[PDB]
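In practice, a research group might receive sequence data for several interacting partners and want a quick structural hypothesis before committing to experiments. The following worked case mirrors that situation: the sequences arrive first, and a predicted assembly follows.
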Amino acid sequence: ELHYIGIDTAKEKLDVDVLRPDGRHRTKKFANTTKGHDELVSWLKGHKIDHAHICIEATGTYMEPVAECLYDAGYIVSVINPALGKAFAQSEGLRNKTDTVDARMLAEFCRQKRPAAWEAPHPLERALRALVVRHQALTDMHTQELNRTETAREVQRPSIDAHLLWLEAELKRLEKQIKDLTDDDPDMKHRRKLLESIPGIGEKTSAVLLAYIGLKDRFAHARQFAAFAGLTPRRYASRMSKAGHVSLRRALYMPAMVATSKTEWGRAFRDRLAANGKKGKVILGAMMRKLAQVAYGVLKSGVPFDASRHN
Amino acid sequence: LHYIGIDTAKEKLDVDVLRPDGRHRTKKFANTTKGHDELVSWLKGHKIDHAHICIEATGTYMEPVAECLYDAGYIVSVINPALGKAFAQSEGLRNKTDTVDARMLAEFCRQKRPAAWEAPHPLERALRALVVRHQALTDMHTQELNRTETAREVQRPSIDAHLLWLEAELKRLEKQIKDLTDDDPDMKHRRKLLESIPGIGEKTSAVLLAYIGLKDRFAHARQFAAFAGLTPRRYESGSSVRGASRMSKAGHVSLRRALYMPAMVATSKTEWGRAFRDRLAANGKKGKVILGAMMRKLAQVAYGVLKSGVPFDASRHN
Amino acid sequence: ELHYIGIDTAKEKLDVDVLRPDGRHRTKKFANTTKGHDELVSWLKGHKIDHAHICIEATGTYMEPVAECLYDAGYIVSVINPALGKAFAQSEGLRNKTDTVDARMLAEFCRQKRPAAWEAPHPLERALRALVVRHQALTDMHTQELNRTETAREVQRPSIDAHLLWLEAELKRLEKQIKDLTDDDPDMKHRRKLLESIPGIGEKTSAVLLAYIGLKDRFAHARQFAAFAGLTPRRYESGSSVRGASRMSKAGHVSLRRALYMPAMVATSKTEWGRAFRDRLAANGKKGKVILGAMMRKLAQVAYGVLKSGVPFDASRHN
Amino acid sequence: LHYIGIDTAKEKLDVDVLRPDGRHRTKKFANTTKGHDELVSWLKGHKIDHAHICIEATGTYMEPVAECLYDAGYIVSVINPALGKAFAQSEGLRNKTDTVDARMLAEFCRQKRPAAWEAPHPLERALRALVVRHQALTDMHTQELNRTETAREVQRPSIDAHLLWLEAELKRLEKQIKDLTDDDPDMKHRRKLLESIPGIGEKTSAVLLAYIGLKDRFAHARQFAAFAGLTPRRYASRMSKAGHVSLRRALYMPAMVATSKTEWGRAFRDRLAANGKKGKVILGAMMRKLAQVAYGVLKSGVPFDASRHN
RNA sequence: GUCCGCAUGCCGUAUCGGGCCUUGGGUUCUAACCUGUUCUGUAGAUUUAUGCAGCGGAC
RNA sequence: AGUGAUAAACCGGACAGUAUCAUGGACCGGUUUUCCCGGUAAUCCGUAUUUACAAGGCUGGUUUCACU
DNA sequence: TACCACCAAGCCGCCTTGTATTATCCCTC
DNA sequence: AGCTCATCTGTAGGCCCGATGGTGGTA
DNA sequence: GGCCATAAGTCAATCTACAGATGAGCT
DNA sequence: GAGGGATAATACAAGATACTGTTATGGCC
Ligand SMILES: [Mg+2]
Ligand SMILES: [Mg+2]
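A structural hypothesis for the assembly, expressed as C-alpha cells:
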C-alpha cells in the first residue's frame, strides 16, 4: 500500500504529486512555510496516506525544512542528486520542464528506482559543516585582498590593509569556534585527534574531513569516501571525475603537497609513481585520493596512523 | 515474464536475460539469419516463452533480429538510443564507460516497461523508402543548382548533364510514389484527405503519409506534433528560471523539414493560414516564430483530418 | 631619423627591439627596475637614438613605470590595447611561427600604424580612478555577503553580520575620501556638479564618469566616449546574404559600462526626459533591456556633452 | 601613387581611393562590364594613372574587375580574406560594413604594400576547373556508394542507376583532363615528370599540375608545401592547414601508398616510426614531403631519382 | 556642389554574484596495488561606420 | 474528484547546401653585430578531406468544453 | 529633513550503427 | 615559536536564488 | 489547362601580465 | 601481357569571404 510522492521545491511554494498504488495521481501545491508544511502532512493524512516514499531534489536551503518535516511525520524521504533527476527526465523522454512536470517526474523516479532513504544530519554535524564552509568563504576573500596588494595603488593600500587585518582576526576567532565545537563533544574530539595523527593532515584539514565524514561511519569502503569527494578517476585516457564535494577536494591539495614532499610515507608514494613517468600534478591528484581513503580508513580502524601499514 | 536486452553490432549480437528470480543468462550470437534462429532456439531451450525484449535503434542492423523475435511471439521494444544513454546516467552519478550494454537494456526494460514495437506494413516501408530517396535526390539537385551560379564554362556542360539526369529521376520517383498510393485503396483515400488541407500538396502528402502510416498509431494529434519535434519546449522553475520557449526539435528531422515551405504557403496564401498568422502577429510574434507555429499546426491538423476521415473543413478554424 | 622601438614587458624583465631607418635591428634585454629603466635610456643615447616612437602593450601595472620613464626621456610612447597587437600578428601572415607578440612585432606595429601618443594621466585622475575602482571592489564584496544572508545557517550569521557592518563603514569612508578629493580641486568640484545636474546621475555615477572622462577634453566627439565605454552598437553587414542583427559592442571599460545601468533604469522610469526617450523607442517596438542599453549610451554622450558645454543639464535640448 | 580598396559583392562594388595628401574619394559601382568601364573612366577622370589596388579574394565575383584593372595598367593585389579580417581587428574597427571595408583595404594596401597579383593562364584555369569538377563528382559517387550499404530494395535501382551515370561521367572528365595536358607540350612533359614519383599516379599528377602552374612561380619547394597547408606550427606542433584544401586532400592516399608500397616511402616511414611517431603523424609528414618533392622534381626537370632520398 | 559643427534622429538584451547536492572500476580486494593535471583567484588596456538622415554654420 | 472529447486557444526562429583565397619554422652559404642577397627533391618539427561521408531512432506542457 | 521601493529580467535538439578516397603490388585468365 | 617551500597547455554534472543607484513619493 | 513568382530568413566582447592555500621540519 | 581485387592509415580540436534551394498556391497567360 506504498504511495510514491515527488516534491518540486521553490522559495515560495511546493508542488506535490502523489502516485497511488492503483496508478492515478493526486496533485496539490502548498506554501513553502511551517504552516504550509503542516497543511501538507494533514493533506496526506486526509487521504489516509501513512506508508509513502517521498522523493525530493537536493536544491539546498528551500527543500531542507520540508524534508525534515516529513521525516519526522514518519515517511521514507529520499533526497536525490539533481543531476540524476535531469538524466531521468531525459530517459522518460519529456519535452517540457515545469513545476508540476518535475513533481510527477520525481514520483516516477521514486517508484522505478526506489532510492536509499535520507537521514537528517546530527545538529553538531550541521554546525561544524556551516563553520567550515564559512571559514572557506573568508579564506577566499582574504586571498582576493592579498592578490590586490601586488598591484595596488598607494591610495588603495590603507583600505586593503585594514580589510586584511579584519579578515585575519575573523579567521582566528572562527578557527577557535571550530576547536571549541569539536572539543566539547567527546567523539569529535577523539576522531579529530585520530585524523591529525596522519602526517600531512593538520588542524584545518582535520576539521574539513570531519565535517563531511561526520560522527558515524556511513561508507562501507574507504574507496567510496574518496569517490564522494570526486577524487577517484573516470574513463572519459582517464580523468579525475570531480563528481563530488568541492570543499573536500579543495581542502586536500596542500596536504597532498606536504605529504609528497615532507613525509616519509608520502615521498615513498611520490617516488614510485614518478618512476612510471607520472607528472607532478598527476601524483598530487593521486595523493589527494589516498589522503581521503586513509582519513576514512583511520577513523574506521579507531587507532592512530600506523606507518608500517604503508610504504 | 523475463526481461531481455540485446546490444547490437553489424556482426555480433550480445544478449542478456534477466530472470524473475533476479539471476542472469548471457550469450553472444552472430547478427545473421542463422544466429537469429540460434537465438530463438536458445530462448526456448531455457523455456522462455514470455519475455519483453529491449533493443536500441542503432541503424538498420537491428531491424531483422527485431522482426525475428516479434514473429517468434515476444514483446519487442525498439528504443531511441538517446533514452538508453540517459537511463545509464540516471542509474549512477560517476558510473563507468558511459555506454549502454545488454544488461543496462534489460534493466531499462524492467523499470520502464516501454511501449511495444510493431513491424511496419510492407507498403508503409516502401513508401517511406521512396520518400527518403526523393529527398536525397532533391538535395543533390540543389547542390548542382548552387554550382551553376559560379561555374566555369568548362564545368558547365557536366553540371547541366547531371541536372537533366536528376530532374528526370525525381520525375520518375514521384510517379513511382503516386503508383504506390493509388494502388492501395486506403493510401489513395488518406492522401486525398491530406491534400484537401490548404498548404499541403503532392510532395507533403507523401511525406506525411510516410510517417503517419496506414493505421492510427497516435491516440491524439498533439502526439504526432510532438513526434515531429514541433511543439514548444517550456523551461520553467520557481520564480528565478524563465527559459524562453524554443521549438523542441525532439523528433523526425525529415518530417520537420518537409513542413517549412507548406507553412510559408499557408501563412501567406490561404485564408485559414493568414488568419493564424495575423493573430500571432498581433501578439507580437516574429516571422519564423509564426512559421514554427504553423508547422506544428499543419502536423496537428494533418493527423486530425485523417482521424476525422473527412475533407478539411475550414469552419473548424479561424 | 625616427626609430621605431617595441618593448615586450614582463614582471621582472624587459625585452627591447629597435628598428633602425636602414632596416637593421638592435636588441637588448633589461631588468624591469628603476635601475634597468635608466640603463635602457642610456643604451638608447648610446646608439645616438634621440627621436623614436616606442610601442608598449597594455599588460597591467608592470609596464607603467617604464612608459613614464621613456615619456620623460622625451620619446614618443604609445601604449596599445593587447588585442590590437594579437590581430596585427595575424595580419602579418597566415602561418606565423607563433601567435604571440614579441618586441620585434611591436616595432613593426609602430612603423606601420604610427599609433596615437600616450600621455601619463594627472595624479588626481590617477587617485580618483583608484578610489572609484576600490569602491566597486568593496561593493561587490558587500554584495556577496548580502547574498549569503539569504541562505545562511544561524551559526554563520554573526560572522556575516559583522562583516557587513565593516564593509558598510568602509564604503562610507571611501565615498567621503572621493568627495574630499573632488571638492579640494576647483575644476573637479565644478565638473562633478555639472554631471549631477543630469537627471539619473548622482554622487556615485558622477565620480565614475569623472574617473574616465578626466580633467581635460580628451575626446573629440561624444560618440567616441560612448564607444570608449563599449556602448555603441556593432553593425555587421556584407552584400545581401550576410546581415547579422546589431548588438552592443562591449568593446570598452566594464567599470564605466556597469556604472550606467542602474542610472538608465532610474532615468527611463522616473525622469521626464528619460520617459520621453523610453516612449519613443517603445513606439518603434523595442524591449526593456534594449531600451536600457540605448539609454546607457545616451547618458554617456550627454555626460560628455554637458561637460563640454560647461553649463547645467538643459532638458529642452532633448525633445 | 594612390592606394585603392575595392569591396566586392555579387551586384555592387564599393571603391575607396586614398590620395597621397590623405584625402578619400568614394564611389559605388555595378559589378558588370559596364560598371568596370565606369570605374576605369572615373579613375582616369581624376588623373589616377599610377595606383595600387587591393581586392580580397571573395569568390569569383572579384575576378572580372581584377582582370579589368590589371589590363588598365594598374597594380592589383588579391589578398587572403583572413589577412583582411585580422587587419581590420588591428585597426580596432568595431563596425563591419561595405563602405568601411573598402576604406580598410586601401589602408591595408598603404601599410603592407602586398605582392602583385598575376592573372593565371587560360590553360591553368581550365585544368583547375576540371580537376575541381572531378573531385566534386567523386564526392557524390562516394555518397551514393555509402547508401548501397543500407539501401532498401525499392531504393537500390535508383542508386545503381546514379552510380553508373557518375562512373561514366568521371571517366569522361579524366579523358578531358588528359586531352588537355597532352595537347600542350609543357603540361605533357611536366605531368610525365610528376608521375615518375613512386606514390603519384594519374589523379594526383593532374591535381598537382593544377596548383603548380605552367611556370615555376615558387622560388623554393618549401613554399609550395606551405601553399598546401602541410607545414607544422606551434599553438605541441600540428599541421597548420592554412592552404589549399583541394590540394591538401589529394595527397593523403598517395602518402599511404608511398609509406606502404615504395622503397623511398617505407624508408621515410621506418625512420620516423623508430623515433616514436604515430601512423597518421607519419602520413602528415609524407604529405608535406610529396608536395615538396613534387615541386622539386619539376624544377630539376628530370625524372624522380631515388638515390637523392636513400 | 563642397567643407565643418551636433548633449540630435536611426542602429543598442548591463555588470557582477549567492546557496546546495555527489557512497568508482579493475586487482594479489578496501589505511595495500593499477587507473588520478586541486580549488579559488588578481590587475590592466578599449577615442565616432558621422555610415545615412535631419538641423545649424562657412563657402 | 472521476469519465469522455479536442483539426480550438496559450506556450514555437525548419532543414539542407554552394563557391573562392592561402609562396613555412628552420638549416647552410655570401655580405655583415640581426637589413638584404643566394641555396635546399637532404635532416628536424607534421593526427588528410580548415566540420570526410552514410543510414536509422523521437507518441508535448497547460488551458477550455460536456457529463456525474 | 530623512527613509522607502521600485524600475529592468532571452535565445543557436539528442543518440547509435556504419564506410571512401588512390596507386602499386600481386594473383588470375 | 615563526618562517619557508613543494605543483604549473587544458578537458565535472545539476537545481534553486539576489544586488547594483537615483528619484519621486511618503513620513 | 500550363507556367511562374512568391512567402520566411537574430545573435551571445577581445587581449596581456600575474597569485594563494597548509603543514611539517628547521633555525 | 592485360585486368581486377587488396591494401596501407584512424582520442578530440583548433582560418576567412561571398552566395542559394525547398513547396503550393493564386494570379496570369
Ligand atoms: Mg526542481
Ligand atoms: Mg567584402
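Before designing any experiment, note the following. The beta strands of chain A are 3-9, 13-19, 25-31, 52-57, 76-80, 233-235, 238-240. Residues 123-150 of chain A form the longest helix (28 residues).
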